[PDB]
């Protein structure tokens, strides 16, 4: 399903997170999946205002190991486990740029 809220614990086989347009400057989405499977996170063609905003991928819950922070990138692909979090942050006074993050339960059948 499609998500437009500022963060939350999402459980979905195929989810697409879109730009949250509300007043909060930081949103953190924790992705859950049946632990028997791994999560595939895809952030294709990212184009944010470097310096004013970024998307950060964490190994687990907030405070866990940060895998990377980015504002641009043709393709960023990650495979993680349930509990993995995607975080978006922007500076006050900077309107959020359009983004789209895709998470999928990685399976072949």
């Amino acid at each position: 399903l499609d998500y437009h809220a500022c963060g939350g614990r999402l459980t979905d086989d195929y989810g697409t997170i879109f730009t949250y347009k509300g007043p909060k400057t930081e949103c953190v989405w924790t992705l859950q999946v049946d632990p028997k499977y791994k999560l595939l996170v895809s952030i294709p063609t990212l184009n944010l205002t470097c310096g004013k905003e970024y998307v950060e991928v964490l190994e687990g819950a907030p405070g866990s190991k940060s895998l990377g922070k980015f504002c641009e990138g043709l393709s960023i692909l990650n495979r993680g486990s349930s509990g993995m979090t995607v975080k978006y942050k922007r500076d006050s006074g900077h309107p959020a740029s359009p983004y789209e993050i895709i998470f999928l339960r990685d399976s072949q059948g």
Binding site: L1, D13, L40, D106
Partner: protein
């Protein structure tokens, strides 16, 4: 819900969301057309595709089988598609063979 690929060939799926499993026992030709409410667009993703290229391929059409093709594919990860209307067709085709390369197709209605 979870559709068993082979059982649904040639039919129109009306589920707001679900998954289609190809299975390793698919027909040589199988087509599925997803139909959503008129106000919706279909979002589809294949988490992992590794078909025996040269023998198999999957093709997605924006609309029915006569609609614009997104192209034939045989491999990939996080393959995503968005239709322009409330209908989307997926076609699995295998040139010769008995076995099929398994894969999952997730889908859901995206109402803007």
């Amino acid at each position: 819900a979870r559709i068993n690929g082979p059982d649904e060939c040639g039919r129109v799926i009306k589920d707001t969301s679900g998954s289609i499993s190809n299975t390793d026992r698919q027909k040589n030709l199988c087509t599925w057309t997803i139909l959503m409410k008129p106000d919706q667009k279909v979002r589809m993703a294949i988490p992992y595709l590794n078909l025996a290229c040269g023998k198999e391929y999957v093709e997605v059409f924006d609309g029915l089988l006569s609609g614009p093709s997104y192209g034939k594919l045989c491999a990939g990860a996080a393959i995503v598609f968005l239709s322009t209307a409330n209908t989307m067709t997926i076609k699995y085709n295998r040139i010769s063979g008995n076995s099929s390369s398994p894969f999952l197709i997730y889908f859901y209605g995206s109402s803007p």
